[PDB]
Amino acid sequence: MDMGISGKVAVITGSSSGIGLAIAEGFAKEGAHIVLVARQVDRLHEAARSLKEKFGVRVLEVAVDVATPEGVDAVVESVRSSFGGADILVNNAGTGSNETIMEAADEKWQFYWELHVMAAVRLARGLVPGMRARGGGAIIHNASICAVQPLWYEPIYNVTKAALMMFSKTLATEVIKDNIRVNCINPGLILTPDWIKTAKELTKDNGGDWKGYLQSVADEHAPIKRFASPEELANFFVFLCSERATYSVGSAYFVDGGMLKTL
Amino acid sequence: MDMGISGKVAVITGSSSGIGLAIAEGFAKEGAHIVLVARQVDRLHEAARSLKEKFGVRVLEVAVDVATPEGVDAVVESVRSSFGGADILVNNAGTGSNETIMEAADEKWQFYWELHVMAAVRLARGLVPGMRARGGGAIIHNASICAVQPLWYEPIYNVTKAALMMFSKTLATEVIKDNIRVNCINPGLILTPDWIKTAKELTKDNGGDWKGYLQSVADEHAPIKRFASPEELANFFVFLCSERATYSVGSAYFVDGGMLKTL
Amino acid sequence: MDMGISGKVAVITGSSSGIGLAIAEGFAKEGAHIVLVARQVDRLHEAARSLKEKFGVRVLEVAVDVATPEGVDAVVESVRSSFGGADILVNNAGTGSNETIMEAADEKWQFYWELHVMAAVRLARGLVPGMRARGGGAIIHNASICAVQPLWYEPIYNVTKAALMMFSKTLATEVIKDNIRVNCINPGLILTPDWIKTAKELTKDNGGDWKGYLQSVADEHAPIKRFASPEELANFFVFLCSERATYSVGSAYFVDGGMLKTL
Amino acid sequence: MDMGISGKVAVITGSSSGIGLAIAEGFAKEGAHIVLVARQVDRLHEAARSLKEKFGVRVLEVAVDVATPEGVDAVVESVRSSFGGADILVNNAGTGSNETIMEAADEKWQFYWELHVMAAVRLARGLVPGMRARGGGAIIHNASICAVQPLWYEPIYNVTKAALMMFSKTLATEVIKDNIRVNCINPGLILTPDWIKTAKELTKDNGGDWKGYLQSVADEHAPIKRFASPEELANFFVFLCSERATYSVGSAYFVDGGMLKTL
């Protein structure tokens, strides 16, 4: 299936490693030019070169913090000057949380709000004009299964991911007149660096069986009884941003291997 | 049906007028002592006296802004010193919004976040300990039909009400061990001061038929083809905070007259 | 709270025992006259005696199978002859299932369809005309938490309860014009004779500790860590059919002690 | 993107015209062999000719009524004899309804139950064993946006499509162990012969402007302001049955151009 993505400009946040990078690799395969946005400068270099060397696409690096207005502003200016504008926006930047409502500081609630919601909000305000002028395009929000099905230990992640999911929906109705399709992807258990590292830290005192630990999490939560590869998830982002998905508007697509327990 | 609410302490935000006041009136009828929280000092006096004179309950007035930490802190201290703690918390404070994502300022997103989410968050941290020590109780979040079904003109209200709805759910799972039931009520079209006033303002230039305007909004959105009285809504808050609703935990109850178009 | 249903006529199916009987006692407490519908003739005679003596209301007993068109015809005619019509209809008749899709016979699919969906359909078009001529009324479908959150071992129960939940909302949209409010209740873990008998069967070869079994089902599934009494569920049916819930139209209300994992 | 389904065997019901045919062309494009299932014998012969010439794949035609147990038996036996088993099953057979609950006959309720729900049930337990012996596969149920967002005029369609959506998820949970992914697609406004013929009927006495009628249905219901081509819907069926969607299990995917009003 021809995705019709060749030559398009895709800006992806949280893309120095893990899910963000695999999504960027997915677009590169389809001939998309890629704007990588992340905090980690060195990992950004790693990623950009790897994309160039494997796929031969153009890659622009924007090493900023999207949780701040200044950082978002830098992104939009790098995009404007290099390519004119973007055709594809993927809001992937974010991190899990770990707390109780009773003991977490106000500053932390604020932080995730800035990261998960305000970043998508600011990047939309910033990039939509250029996108509007280029004839339209696609925006994707990577929320989480937690936006609908909260995990007990991360209330702030749950709350702010639900806010993101709703934002996606409201944005969708605002910009569709501009031929801009806005959708939302809710991944389940995705085998990331973060997951492996927390598997290392939690088993260091009981024998370091990290694959055994991961397997029991998957057995507990997912009927398919495995984590997904970031590459598997990536496939869905690419297809939803393609000219093969032209009727997808304001929807929430789950990629969770059965983990969602509700209709 | 005996609600078993007599002598209980109910703290209600946004209660100087409208929905907040009717909820407070609902609790007063059932013999609950009432902590009224609102910004408008004079209207607070009006309300408190009206409750005293009609129902004979104790009424404590807390004239603060719950969108700020200092304001919430004042509430919890007034409650602690007067009654020891609260048995019932109703998070009703809030307001609709009016904007496009493309043109709204960051400050406004922040404001509704502080009002709709952080207030419920701060009041929970503050009041849950006293509630925990009194043997348990009930918390209600008044979100909106918009938390699930967004209205096109108020994205910020939609987003922050969806965040509130999720917060309610995560709080519910955290505090149920303490015999505290946390639920969420999503009202549809409720005939408020705000609605009548916007009906006056929008028809002032075409003949001032404000009841005609309201009726067409109801005809458009609700299968029951009328607004609800605040008193109708109030009934549901009272029952959910009663000892007759002891199995309601982490749920979202819709009072919308058919307005919700989805299962 | 005054429910405002004294003198009303409440038809309740599956009301010889368990939840149905507890619901009927809830209405009888509030002064409503009762039409008890169930299969077992002697169990009915005895429930009817308890209600007449304990509450002092009129009780009609209809000994029929509501899963058949003939059974529902007899309910209609009996209500017509004794009361003229109904003010309240509670569709509670039903049963859990147990099978794999791969093994289950078509007969089994048909039975649960007749029992969960067709029974309510037939009772609706049968009792509605009488209900509208009496000025309107209320209808509640007792579906299940399984209508949204499927249990792995009972796919037929899940499918048919899901169909019922949607039927409830479609009926709501159609009959609100006749001043008839239709709502749906979705119970979680409710302590019924079937759960007790299930727990006894499942533990017969490992110690016979049926209470310990039920406790562990609650611990796994419900954050409240216990089953509901039928009594505390009945409260909700009563309130939703009362004059205090006049704005509830086509809603689904969860009474699940936190069991629903999604918002 | 390489779909990875060349040489696969795709069974598609309701595939003589409209969406079913467009789906089958989608699979044939990707090199899959096709089992066309439909009622009309000559329409099938002709669709089969187009697919063989235009794409160069093997096409089996099964002229049966899948709404009956005999019809589905013949599909099973014909796949068994020609291919041995299926790798892909798309349940598309179906039709919109038109009635009030109050007027509709029990026969009509039964028909749509047989057609929307029982057909998929019977095809599942019939084709699954062959599918698992081939190493696994994919199954998609074409329900509707009406399975979640009911249209007022077709309650039976709403109920049975809601039952199907839940069936899809229950099957998903049961057969993922056999490496079989089951997912559900919920289309919005799709430009089909039935919509065209509906628009012609509805406008015969007011000017015969059927295109203008369809445009106004889109304007009212869908923010994208247009109907989807069957082609753009097919894309989604293909991708979801491909080797690129290996983590999609028991999900419901909306292709509705913004029509779904809730998130």
- Residue in B69, B152, B161 closest to A173 by CB: B152
The partner residues of A114 in beta bridges, in order of sequence, read none
The partner residues of D140 in beta bridges, in order of sequence, read D90, D183
- D89 φ/ψ angles, rounded to the nearest 5 degrees: -125, 125
User: Using CB atoms and an 8 Å cut-off, which of residues 37-66 of chain A contact chain D?
Assistant: none
Owning domain of residue A83: 1-263
What residue in B sits closest to D145 (Cα-Cα)? B262
Q: Do C173 and B233 touch (CB under 8 A)?
A: no
With tokens 């089958």, the residue in question is D24
Residue D139, H or E segment:
strand D137-142
Pair type for strands A88-91 and A137-142: parallel
> Is D222 strand, coil or helix?
coil
Instruction: Tell me how many domains chain B contains.
Output: 1
- Angstrom resolution of this structure: 2.4
Best CA proximity match to C35, nearest among C69, C72, C9, C57: C9
Chains that contact A by 3+ CB pairs under 8 Å? B, C, D
The CA distance from B235 to the nearest CA of chain D, in Å, is 26
Burial C111-150 (b: 16+ CB within 10 A, else e): bbbbbbbbbbbbbbbbbbebbbebeebbbbbbbbbbbbbb
Q: Please, are residues C22 and C231 in contact by the beta-carbon 8 Å criterion?
A: yes
Q: Please, are residues C22 and C46 in contact by the beta-carbon 8 Å criterion?
A: no
The CA distance from B174 to the nearest CA of chain A, in Å, is 7
Q: How far apart are CA C254 and CA C248, in angstroms?
A: 14
Best CA proximity match to C255, nearest among C160, C173, C187: C187
* Residue C29: other Cβ atoms inside 10 A: 17
Pair type for strands C137-142 and C88-91: parallel
Instruction: Please give the structure tokens belonging to residue B51.
Output: 């409750």
CA distance to B46, C77, D24, D112, D201, per residue, from C72 (Å): 55, 9, 45, 22, 38
Q: Do B263 and C169 touch (CB under 8 A)?
A: yes
Residue A173: is it exposed, middle or buried by C-beta count within 10 angstroms (0-12/13-18/19+)? buried
A92 is in an annotated binding site: yes
Q: What single letter denotes the amino acid at residue A5?
A: I
What residue in C sits closest to B177 (Cα-Cα)? C224
With tokens 């892909």, the residue in question is D88
Q: What single letter denotes the amino acid at residue A109?
A: W
Contact list, D100 vs chain C (CB under 8 Å): 174
Pair type for strands D9-13 and C252-255: unpaired
Measured between CB atoms, does A121 come within 8 Å of chain C?
Answer: no
Q: How far apart are CA D155 and CA C24, in angstroms?
A: 29
What DSSP character marks residue D229?
P
Q: What single letter denotes the amino acid at residue A216?
A: S
Q: Do B150 and D260 touch (CB under 8 A)?
A: no
With tokens 């719950």, the residue in question is B66
Q: Please, are residues D28 and D237 in contact by the beta-carbon 8 Å criterion?
A: no
Best CA proximity match to D126, nearest among D75, D169, D90: D75
- A36 φ/ψ angles, rounded to the nearest 5 degrees: -90, 130
* Spatial CB neighbours of D179, under 8 Å, sequence gap ≥ 6: D132, D135, D136, D137
CA distance to A150, A203, A228, D253, per residue, from A187 (Å): 13, 25, 9, 14
Dihedral of CA atoms B97, B102, B108, B113 in degrees, nearest 10, equals: 80
Ordered alpha helix ranges (H), C137-229: 155-175, 193-202, 210-221
Query: Treating both helix axes as pointing N-terminal to C-terminal, what angle do D18-29 and D41-55 enclose, rounded to 10 degrees?
Result: 30
Instruction: Please give the structure tokens belonging to residue C194.
Output: 């079937």
Q: A135 — alpha (psi -120 to 50), left (phi > 0) or beta?
A: left
Q: How far apart are CA D7 and CA D44, in angstroms?
A: 21
Q: D257 — alpha (psi -120 to 50), left (phi > 0) or beta?
A: left
With tokens 């997103």, the residue in question is B109
Q: How far apart are CA A123 and CA A240, in angstroms?
A: 19
- Residue in C150, C162, C261 closest to A149 by CB: C261
Q: How far apart are CA C167 and CA D112, in angstroms?
A: 14
The partner residues of D252 in beta bridges, in order of sequence, read D184
CA distance to A46, A87, B120, D55, per residue, from A51 (Å): 9, 19, 45, 35
User: Using CB atoms and an 8 Å cut-off, which of residues 62-91 of chain C contact chain D?
Assistant: 69
Q: How far apart are CA B248 and CA B182, in angstroms?
A: 8
Measured between CB atoms, does B226 come within 8 Å of chain D?
Answer: no
| D95 alpha-carbon distance from chain centroid | 10
- A98 φ/ψ angles, rounded to the nearest 5 degrees: -165, 95
Q: How far apart are CA B49 and CA B59, in angstroms?
A: 8
Q: How far apart are CA C49 and CA B216, in angstroms?
A: 51
| Strand intervals (E) in D176-242 | 180-187
Q: Please, are residues C79 and C127 in contact by the beta-carbon 8 Å criterion?
A: yes
What length does chain D have? 263
With tokens 């500081």, the residue in question is A105
Measured between CB atoms, does C120 come within 8 Å of chain A?
Answer: no
Q: Do D257 and A238 touch (CB under 8 A)?
A: no
Q: Do A247 and D239 touch (CB under 8 A)?
A: no
Q: Which CATH number covers residue C162? A: 3.40.50.720
Strand order of the sheet with strand C59-63?
C59-63, C33-38, C9-13, C88-91, C137-142, C180-187, C252-255
User: Is C157 assigned a catalytic role?
Assistant: yes
Contact list, D239 vs chain A (CB under 8 Å): 1, 239, 244
* Spatial CB neighbours of A21, under 8 Å, sequence gap ≥ 6: A15, A47, A230
With tokens 């967002």, the residue in question is D149
